[PDB]
Amino acid sequence: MNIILKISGKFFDEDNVDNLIVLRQSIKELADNGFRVGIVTGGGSTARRYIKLAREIGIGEAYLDLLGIWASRLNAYLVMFSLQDLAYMHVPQSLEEFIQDWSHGKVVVTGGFQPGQSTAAVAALVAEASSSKTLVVATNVDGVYEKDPRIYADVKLIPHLTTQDLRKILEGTYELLDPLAIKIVERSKIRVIVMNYRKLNRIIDILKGEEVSSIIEPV
Amino acid sequence: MNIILKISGKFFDEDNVDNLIVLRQSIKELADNGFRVGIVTGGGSTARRYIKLAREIGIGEAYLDLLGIWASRLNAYLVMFSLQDLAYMHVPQSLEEFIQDWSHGKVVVTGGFQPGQSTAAVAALVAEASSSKTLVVATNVDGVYEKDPRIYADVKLIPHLTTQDLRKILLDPLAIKIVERSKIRVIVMNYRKLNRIIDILKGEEVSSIIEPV
Amino acid sequence: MNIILKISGKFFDEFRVGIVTGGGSTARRYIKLAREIGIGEAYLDLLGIWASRLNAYLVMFSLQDLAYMHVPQSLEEFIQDWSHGKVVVTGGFQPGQSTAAVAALVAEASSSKTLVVATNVDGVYEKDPVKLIPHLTTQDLRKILEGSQAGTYELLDPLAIKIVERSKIRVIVMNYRKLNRIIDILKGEEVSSIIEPV
Amino acid sequence: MNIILKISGKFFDEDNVDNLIVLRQSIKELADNGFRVGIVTGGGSTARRYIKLAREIGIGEAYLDLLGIWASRLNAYLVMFSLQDLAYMHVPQSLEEFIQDWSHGKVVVTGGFQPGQSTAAVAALVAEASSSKTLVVATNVDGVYEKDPRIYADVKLIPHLTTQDLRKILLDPLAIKIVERSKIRVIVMNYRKLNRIIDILKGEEVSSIIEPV
Amino acid sequence: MNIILKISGKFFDEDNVDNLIVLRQSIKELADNGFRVGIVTGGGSTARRYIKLAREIGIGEAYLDLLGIWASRLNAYLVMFSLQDLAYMHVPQSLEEFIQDWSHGKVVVTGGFQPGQSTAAVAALVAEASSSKTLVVATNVDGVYEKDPRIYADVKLIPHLTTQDLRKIELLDPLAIKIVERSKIRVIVMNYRKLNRIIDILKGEEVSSIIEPV
Amino acid sequence: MNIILKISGKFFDEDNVDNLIVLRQSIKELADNGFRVGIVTGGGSTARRYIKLAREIGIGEAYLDLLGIWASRLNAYLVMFSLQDLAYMHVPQSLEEFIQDWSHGKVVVTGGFQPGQSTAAVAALVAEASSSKTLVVATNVDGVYEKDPADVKLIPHLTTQDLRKILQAGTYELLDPLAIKIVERSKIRVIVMNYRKLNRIIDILKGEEVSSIIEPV
Ligand SMILES: O=c1ccn([C@@H]2O[C@H](COP(=O)(O)OP(=O)(O)OP(=O)(O)O)[C@@H](O)[C@H]2O)c(=O)[nH]1
Ligand SMILES: O=c1ccn([C@@H]2O[C@H](COP(=O)(O)OP(=O)(O)OP(=O)(O)O)[C@@H](O)[C@H]2O)c(=O)[nH]1
Ligand SMILES: O=c1ccn([C@@H]2O[C@H](COP(=O)(O)OP(=O)(O)OP(=O)(O)O)[C@@H](O)[C@H]2O)c(=O)[nH]1
Ligand SMILES: O=c1ccn([C@@H]2O[C@H](COP(=O)(O)OP(=O)(O)OP(=O)(O)O)[C@@H](O)[C@H]2O)c(=O)[nH]1
Ligand SMILES: O=c1ccn([C@@H]2O[C@H](COP(=O)(O)OP(=O)(O)OP(=O)(O)O)[C@@H](O)[C@H]2O)c(=O)[nH]1
Ligand SMILES: O=c1ccn([C@@H]2O[C@H](COP(=O)(O)OP(=O)(O)OP(=O)(O)O)[C@@H](O)[C@H]2O)c(=O)[nH]1
Ligand SMILES: [Mg+2]
Ligand SMILES: [Mg+2]
């Protein structure tokens, strides 16, 4: 079926050929398992770096967001140019445009759409519009934690939880599933799989629940 | 300065030639009084009708939203055509497009942008992007009340309050988030009084002013 | 081959395929409201076109995964969207005509030999509310039509007739209630009126 | 006041610089006198040669039309490029696009829009959309006659007539339908005389004026 | 395999249906053998008819270029319209658009993109962007000779050469050469009269000059 | 009259708030002096980083260029966004689009257009299309030298042919081949200067200051 893959921005800040090489194989691996793949790429450091520079000279919040969006699109193009042929050569700039590009039956790579949200929201929207039952959020963490492994000791990894639990835990910045994202995944009952992009090579396993991952169930 | 005017959908469901006429005279006042007006029109009943009909046959939530957006755009075109020669002849379909159309120095009429939100959000976004310090929400009510007068007795009208007060109580999430971060004040008023919009803005005529916090 | 299906607007008020949807009551509801405040004729037409497109989206969205997700706004755009090999739903294109004309244009551009006009009547008559003409020609229809404008056009307006004739496209007028019985109407003779180009 | 100027295709076949020269002049003069000018250029011989050639190898009628449209656009670009800095640098490809380009307040040059009609229809549509009360059709003849003036001797020019008078005889069906419903008067004149365009418009120079009815 | 076909402007001036008839035939041949084909059409005489006229009244060099581009696009439409159902119905106006239109898997016909270059450069760019290892330049002459064959008894066609041997010497501008070299695209110069023997040309069983990148 | 200002990519790599400001200034100055300004922003390090990352996994040369172009547009947006309502809110992606955006009478900010060239070429094209008689190339250097600075001196006046003799996604040049070809045929003079002096742009333009003026020939 259809599946949306949200690649965290950090993924591009790293500068190591192996990242793209592996993401590319996994996009193929997912393909050879009868999977249509949509990919959303975040802005990463390029985004933050420009948002800061822009903010420094007083650029309004709306425009700071656009800069982050454009930065996320630059990453989108990078992913796409390595997916060449395999992907539809256009980076939709709105959900409506995505819906169109998705018609062509190839992989579609997206960046941001609108100010006031994050690529997480985009991933949700795109997942909903593409009838994807699963939204994989590949980030630099292994999964979801009750508090924060960085600041609290032995906060064991929650391999399963609902949009309710994730709400209490979370109870241009973000989260991982900002408000709009959660709202969308819930109304369209899309399950979110948080995993480490280091394991994109074991995505097929992740999807069928055989590897370190956190699955958020809609409720 | 710049100002955004959010016209509730009900405004178009009434079909009384006087609504468009009055709205048309007011956009002209604001204009001949040093304002650049941006207008956001809601889907109204057309939106609901199509959403209803579409839902009935199982159209996904994303697509029901698109239908409401297109309906809101149809109202956008209606408002735009009557103001001809005061408005830029294009209904932007995204904030990015709005920003572009706004460059032309004329009135810009908009409908929805993206699924998952309401024209309220669009009005906020558009207000923020156009550096509008005030977002006027023209609806079928006089303003904000501590609880709806429909059900509680002796509910007067809050002539002033802040985002926090409004919290304790249309403005969807994104709208509030935007008006707060960019400190945009929202003026809730009755579209029946668009002929007194200049007064409203300077705090006279009956209205509820939501202050950002 | 290819076939174009023109869905009358009333439909919403209640083999490759191209679909054209009319504005219906939404179109006329706006057209009268717009006219009331003096909106020019060109713009009234645009309102009708937008209304027709709104219907186009509704139809498109329901056929999802069968239709190319874009509503062309001009013949040139249609030709392009048609390249993708999926169903294409269209609304109006230009002022001064009706979706009928669009259907014809679209039929011609797509090399469709048949244009099916599904309306709120079983076929072509001679007058409305009288017998049903089960088989006529572009000339007979042109005559059955006559003079005595955003909102109201004739079954097949001037441009539609001109197009169907020059490209020899046969027009099948039916009842959208029998849309389901299209494989037969089309190829049968059932309760349909077939207009032969001449 | 807005005014639409339809330049006959022949204008470009003469490979006459003198024609483009006088056009710029009049566009410049019209602008001066407070007129917004929309220009529609026909396909001319280029359109002819291409359609001919295309037809020869069996291209469909729809596509032959598109080729004439493209050829009319090529002329549109030529006129535009010469009007540079006075014209909006884009040749709209549909009435909807024209409406948009016209918002920018500069001269807009157009070619064809859709198959099945002629630039005359385009001129009419564009005139209607831009609220022009006059559509000037500039051809290689001083005006309307009852028979061709170059062949028939003793043909007198008809200075005034009606849409019907014309029917009872340069204007395709759509064009006439449009000029009538929107009551646009059409002035047929010789493009050799465009520089005297200001006189033509005020009934103080040779020309045929078709009154809508 | 992807391949780009550059049709010289003269091709359209003969008002030769003969030419179009054979182009359409070889596209079919190419499609029928699993070749994706991108086509670039030059402005030909139409281009110079409009440029000459424009220059006459002082239109700037940038705009003269645009006129030639539009002229080449008009030819692009003509070729496209005859390929109907075999080609994507849009004439990209920039390399970025071409890349997009090419995604659709059908034949793409192009004209010019930007001022300051020729369709040759467009053909090279498009070849590079579409990963075509071969760029066929169909001219009205069998290939490249040692001495001009126009008026020079039979001379002798040189079957092999390099982009360097090309420099040591129309239909080839600076950008074109830079591109074919950096992306190592081989260029085949051949007569458009022979465009249906195109399958042979490509494999060496037919007359032509092959420029090797270096 | 019109003038095109080419901002070197390094200008954005310094990530200095001041950089953006002084620009926003000169524009207002230049503007307030009967000058319409077109601005072309290069890709800088962002472009370069992507061009190398992309190349590492084998992305073709055409696509590496596109990445550079998009990176240069990102800078274009940044510059545009900082120029409040002074600039037309759209980053043209082709000369044809530039010509259109330029009609609106406001500042237009551009990035790349097409593979195979550099923003220098874009600046030249844009200058020619906009009838600009002068193309200002603001780089981090002070002007031109027959050898990049060491110990060499600054050639205050040379010709495009002088530059030729004096003179791959990434590969720079001051003026690449297309740029020179364009500036020559349309006789556009190019003023090479240090972007540190954007503030003194009005002086530069009238000869009074540290700059190298390349005369077309
Ligand atoms: O649709 C969008 C996307 C992004 N943005 C803006 O750009 C920025 C990029 O937001 P992202 O959510 O793309 O950042 P990221 O990729 O680094 O996130 P993680 O992978 O670390 O989870 C955000 O901070 C926001 O301001 C929008 O405004 N809208
Ligand atoms: O940006 C938008 C706008 C609208 N919509 C969708 O279309 C519908 C129309 O959005 P409205 O905001 O017009 O809804 P409403 O009709 O209740 O508004 P008012 O009476 O208060 O004016 C909403 O119900 C929403 O689902 C979007 O999804 N996104
Ligand atoms: O190409 C087009 C299509 C439509 N329109 C405008 O849209 C409006 C709707 O005209 P339609 O012909 O689309 O309406 P309908 O669906 O009710 O028609 P029937 O099938 O019942 O006969 C008309 O008033 C017309 O002005 C155009 O101007 N141009
Ligand atoms: O909107 C349009 C315009 C033009 N065309 C097609 O292109 C051709 C050009 O139509 P024109 O009306 O421009 O022809 P022309 O140049 O000979 O006209 P004059 O001003 O010289 O009298 C026509 O023959 C028609 O087929 C369209 O299909 N649609
Ligand atoms: O990308 C382009 C293509 C073309 N042009 C401009 O348009 C004209 C037509 O471009 P051509 O490529 O047809 O010129 P040419 O005369 O060398 O062509 P062939 O006989 O080899 O087919 C050229 O003279 C050029 O000025 C551009 O500016 N850019
Ligand atoms: O039109 C364009 C512009 C840029 N590019 C691509 O963008 C990349 C950046 O080329 P730039 O010329 O934008 O770099 P820069 O701004 O840092 O240059 P200087 O002013 O310091 O000399 C180059 O690698 C090139 O391939 C294009 O391909 N086309
Ligand atoms: Mg609502
Ligand atoms: Mg009708």
Ligand SMILES: [Mg+2]
């Ligand atoms: Mg004609």
Ligand SMILES: [Mg+2]
């Ligand atoms: Mg460089």
